[PDB]
Design a protein around this motif. Structure first.
Motif, PDB file in Angstrom:
ATOM      1  N   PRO A  58       0.781  -1.244   0.000  1.00 17.03           N
ATOM      2  CA  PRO A  58       0.000   0.000   0.000  1.00 17.03           C
ATOM      3  C   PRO A  58       0.817   1.301   0.000  1.00 17.03           C
ATOM      4  N   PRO A  59       1.922   1.440   0.792  1.00 18.04           N
ATOM      5  CA  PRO A  59       2.697   2.690   0.818  1.00 18.04           C
ATOM      6  C   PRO A  59       3.124   3.216  -0.546  1.00 18.04           C
ATOM      7  N   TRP A  60       3.294   2.310  -1.508  1.00 12.83           N
ATOM      8  CA  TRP A  60       3.638   2.704  -2.859  1.00 12.83           C
ATOM      9  C   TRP A  60       2.429   2.593  -3.778  1.00 12.83           C
ATOM     10  N   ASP A  61       1.224   2.468  -3.196  1.00 15.29           N
ATOM     11  CA  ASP A  61      -0.029   2.264  -3.924  1.00 15.29           C
ATOM     12  C   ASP A  61       0.108   1.088  -4.881  1.00 15.29           C
ATOM     13  N   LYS A  62       0.751   0.008  -4.405  1.00 12.22           N
ATOM     14  CA  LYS A  62       1.038  -1.157  -5.224  1.00 12.22           C
ATOM     15  C   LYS A  62       0.112  -2.311  -4.856  1.00 12.22           C
ATOM     16  N   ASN A  63      -0.640  -2.758  -5.849  1.00 13.82           N
ATOM     17  CA  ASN A  63      -1.496  -3.910  -5.692  1.00 13.82           C
ATOM     18  C   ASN A  63      -1.722  -4.512  -7.071  1.00 13.82           C
ATOM     19  N   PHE A  64      -0.855  -5.451  -7.447  1.00 13.37           N
ATOM     20  CA  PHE A  64      -0.864  -5.956  -8.799  1.00 13.37           C
ATOM     21  C   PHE A  64      -1.938  -7.008  -8.941  1.00 13.37           C
ATOM     22  N   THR A  65      -2.528  -7.020 -10.143  1.00 13.97           N
ATOM     23  CA  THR A  65      -3.386  -8.093 -10.617  1.00 13.97           C
ATOM     24  C   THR A  65      -2.576  -8.891 -11.632  1.00 13.97           C
ATOM     25  N   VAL A  66      -3.109 -10.039 -12.051  1.00 16.12           N
ATOM     26  CA  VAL A  66      -2.371 -10.970 -12.886  1.00 16.12           C
ATOM     27  C   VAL A  66      -2.154 -10.366 -14.273  1.00 16.12           C
ATOM     28  N   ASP A  67      -3.000  -9.402 -14.656  1.00 16.56           N
ATOM     29  CA  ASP A  67      -2.959  -8.741 -15.947  1.00 16.56           C
ATOM     30  C   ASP A  67      -1.777  -7.761 -16.010  1.00 16.56           C
ATOM     31  N   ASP A  68      -1.166  -7.457 -14.851  1.00 18.72           N
ATOM     32  CA  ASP A  68      -0.152  -6.412 -14.759  1.00 18.72           C
ATOM     33  C   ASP A  68       1.266  -6.940 -14.965  1.00 18.72           C
ATOM     34  N   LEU A  69       1.431  -8.264 -14.909  1.00 18.84           N
ATOM     35  CA  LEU A  69       2.722  -8.875 -14.634  1.00 18.84           C
ATOM     36  C   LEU A  69       3.048  -9.951 -15.657  1.00 18.84           C
ATOM     37  N   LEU A  70       4.348 -10.153 -15.866  1.00 16.95           N
ATOM     38  CA  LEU A  70       4.878 -11.355 -16.480  1.00 16.95           C
ATOM     39  C   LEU A  70       6.033 -11.836 -15.610  1.00 16.95           C
ATOM     40  N   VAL A  71       6.336 -13.139 -15.686  1.00 12.05           N
ATOM     41  CA  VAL A  71       7.560 -13.681 -15.118  1.00 12.05           C
ATOM     42  C   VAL A  71       8.456 -14.180 -16.242  1.00 12.05           C
ATOM     43  N   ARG A  72       9.764 -14.064 -16.020  1.00  9.15           N
ATOM     44  CA  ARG A  72      10.740 -14.501 -16.992  1.00  9.15           C
ATOM     45  C   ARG A  72      11.710 -15.448 -16.299  1.00  9.15           C
ATOM     46  N   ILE A  73      11.934 -16.583 -16.967  1.00 11.04           N
ATOM     47  CA  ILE A  73      12.649 -17.717 -16.407  1.00 11.04           C
ATOM     48  C   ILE A  73      13.734 -18.127 -17.394  1.00 11.04           C
ATOM     49  N   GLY A  74      14.859 -18.616 -16.846  1.00  8.86           N
ATOM     50  CA  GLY A  74      15.994 -19.066 -17.635  1.00  8.86           C
ATOM     51  C   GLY A  74      16.763 -17.887 -18.223  1.00  8.86           C
ATOM     52  N   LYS A  75      16.606 -16.719 -17.605  1.00 11.36           N
ATOM     53  CA  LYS A  75      17.279 -15.499 -18.020  1.00 11.36           C
ATOM     54  C   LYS A  75      18.684 -15.406 -17.425  1.00 11.36           C
ATOM     55  N   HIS A  76      19.651 -14.922 -18.216  1.00 10.85           N
ATOM     56  CA  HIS A  76      21.000 -14.692 -17.719  1.00 10.85           C
ATOM     57  C   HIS A  76      21.342 -13.206 -17.786  1.00 10.85           C
ATOM     58  N   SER A  77      21.083 -12.616 -18.948  1.00 11.32           N
ATOM     59  CA  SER A  77      21.131 -11.179 -19.145  1.00 11.32           C
ATOM     60  C   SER A  77      19.992 -10.516 -18.373  1.00 11.32           C
ATOM     61  N   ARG A  78      20.199  -9.247 -17.992  1.00 13.02           N
ATOM     62  CA  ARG A  78      19.130  -8.456 -17.407  1.00 13.02           C
ATOM     63  C   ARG A  78      18.180  -7.934 -18.491  1.00 13.02           C
ATOM     64  N   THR A  79      18.716  -7.349 -19.569  1.00 17.11           N
ATOM     65  CA  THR A  79      17.859  -6.570 -20.456  1.00 17.11           C
ATOM     66  C   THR A  79      17.534  -7.295 -21.763  1.00 17.11           C
ATOM     67  N   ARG A  80      18.467  -8.118 -22.262  1.00 19.33           N
ATOM     68  CA  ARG A  80      18.282  -8.809 -23.530  1.00 19.33           C
ATOM     69  C   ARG A  80      16.989  -9.616 -23.494  1.00 19.33           C
ATOM     70  N   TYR A  81      16.401  -9.891 -24.666  1.00 14.29           N
ATOM     71  CA  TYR A  81      15.439 -10.973 -24.803  1.00 14.29           C
ATOM     72  C   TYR A  81      16.185 -12.198 -25.323  1.00 14.29           C
ATOM     73  N   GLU A  82      16.287 -13.234 -24.491  1.00 10.62           N
ATOM     74  CA  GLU A  82      17.087 -14.392 -24.837  1.00 10.62           C
ATOM     75  C   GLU A  82      16.153 -15.487 -25.343  1.00 10.62           C
ATOM     76  N   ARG A  83      15.946 -15.521 -26.672  1.00  9.79           N
ATOM     77  CA  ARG A  83      14.860 -16.245 -27.334  1.00  9.79           C
ATOM     78  C   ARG A  83      15.004 -17.773 -27.219  1.00  9.79           C
ATOM     79  N   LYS A  84      16.210 -18.297 -27.467  1.00 11.09           N
ATOM     80  CA  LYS A  84      16.415 -19.737 -27.508  1.00 11.09           C
ATOM     81  C   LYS A  84      16.622 -20.289 -26.091  1.00 11.09           C
ATOM     82  N   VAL A  85      16.155 -19.567 -25.061  1.00  8.87           N
ATOM     83  CA  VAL A  85      16.694 -19.804 -23.728  1.00  8.87           C
ATOM     84  C   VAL A  85      15.708 -19.403 -22.627  1.00  8.87           C
TER      85      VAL A  85
END
Ligand code: NAG
Ligand code: NA
Lengths: 35, 65, 259
Positions: free
Chosen positions: C48-75
């Motif tokens: 609440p202090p940051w007016d943060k209350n996410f719904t599932v529509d707000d978010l994605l998770v990323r898995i098997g990532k090594h780089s922070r910013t790249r999109y690592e397609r085969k991975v």
């Protein structure tokens, strides 16, 4: 099955343990247990 | 969350006195020049979050729309 | 991660990045505990202090990532969320008692060299592994320093960082801060003039603190990055959700009929 697959094989990394290879710093962790 | 230093007076949920968070029913009076900061009872505004801001490469459009 | 190193590829295959859809940005770390379930901190989802209350529509998770910013397609795999579960007794007053949440993935993922679940501890594991001075490991894409001169951009890593840090005695944890510490928390980090440093910092929270068992060669998540007063300050410690102590709630949620 609401948990899904993965419990039996958890915690074993394909690029490390599965290949009998150690990561660069895990030795440090074990040293902390021993001395 | 990491509590970091209060950056203006009136803030809370930030480090006010030394390395101590100034919590909810409190607010931080910023010392200027040679003054200590004080955490006092009162209504404070949470220090705003820093956006974990980047230059992300675009992912497939499918993961939005 | 303050004072850490670039993680080797495949070092932490359970590592998950929680991502805001619009604006695209990293929100928090998280961990993979099965083909279908992701563990993170409550405060990554509801604050609440940051007016943060996410719904599932707000978010994605990323898995098997090594780089922070790249999109690592085969991975990397990007997944939507089906459901958010926040511990019912999560107390975001007084610093985050029960700072734990489960995310159910919209779809089960394939495992790979880069994607693989961590083990959750049981009684024996907790009893054997949780001792002051035993080192665990924290990983994340967060800031490499608490502050900066010009821009946050300057302290952001290109690749996943790792740091190894020792569990600290409860009395020492309690003595380091005026915040009330509960049994649902533990602290880790070096004491001043131990001559090593390191800490979680902004953008690492919700990420895992893991320990390797000597007994079975398996990795276990003992912790979730929860809170700190600064990053890497002398006489201060990172605080972490005690996963084992909250395991009953984890089991409840996962074993429930609906999901
Ligand atoms: C959080 O989420 C739901 C909407 O998704 C809402 O009903 C609830 O009141 C929200 N606010 C807080 C502070 O929980
Ligand atoms: Na410290």
């Amino acid at each position: 099955k609401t948990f899904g697959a993965g419990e039996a094989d958890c915690g074993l990394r394909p690029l490390f343990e599965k290949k009998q290879v150690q990561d660069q710093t895990e030795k440090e962790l074990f040293e902390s247990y021993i001395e | 969350v990491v509590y970091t230093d209060c950056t203006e007076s009136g803030q809370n949920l930030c480090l006010c006195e030394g390395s101590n968070v100034x919590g909810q029913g409190n607010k931080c009076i910023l010392g200027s020049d040679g003054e200590k900061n004080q955490x006092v009872t009162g209504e404070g505004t949470p220090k705003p979050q820093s956006h974990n801001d980047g230059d992300f490469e675009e992912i497939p459009e499918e993961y939005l729309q | 991660i303050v004072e850490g190193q670039d993680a080797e590829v495949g070092l932490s295959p359970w590592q998950v990045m929680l991502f805001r859809k619009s604006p695209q940005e990293l929100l928090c770390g998280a961990s993979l505990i099965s083909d279908r379930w992701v563990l993170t901190a409550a405060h990554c989802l509801l604050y609440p202090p940051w007016d943060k209350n996410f719904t599932v529509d707000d978010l994605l998770v990323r898995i098997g990532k090594h780089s922070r910013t790249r999109y690592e397609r085969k991975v990397e795999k990007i997944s939507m969320l089906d459901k958010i579960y926040i511990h019912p007794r999560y107390n975001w007053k007084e610093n985050l008692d029960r700072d734990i949440a489960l995310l159910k993935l919209k779809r089960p993922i394939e495992l790979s060299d880069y994607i693989h679940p961590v083990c959750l501890p049981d009684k024996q594991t907790a009893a054997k592994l949780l001792h002051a001075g035993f080192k665990g490991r924290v990983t994340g894409w967060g800031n490499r320093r608490e502050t900066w001169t010009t821009s946050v951009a300057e302290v952001q890593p290109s690749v996943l960082q790792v740091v190894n840090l020792p569990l600290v005695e409860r009395p020492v944890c309690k003595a380091s801060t005026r915040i009330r510490i509960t049994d649902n928390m533990f602290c880790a980090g070096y004491k001043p003039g131990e001559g090593k440093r390191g800490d979680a910092c902004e953008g690492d929270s919700g990420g895992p603190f893991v320990m390797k068992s000597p007994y079975n060669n398996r990795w276990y998540q003992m912790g979730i990055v929860s809170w700190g007063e600064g990053c890497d300050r002398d006489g201060k410690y990172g605080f972490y959700t005690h996963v084992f102590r909250l395991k009953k709630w984890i089991q409840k949620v996962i074993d429930r009929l609906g999901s």
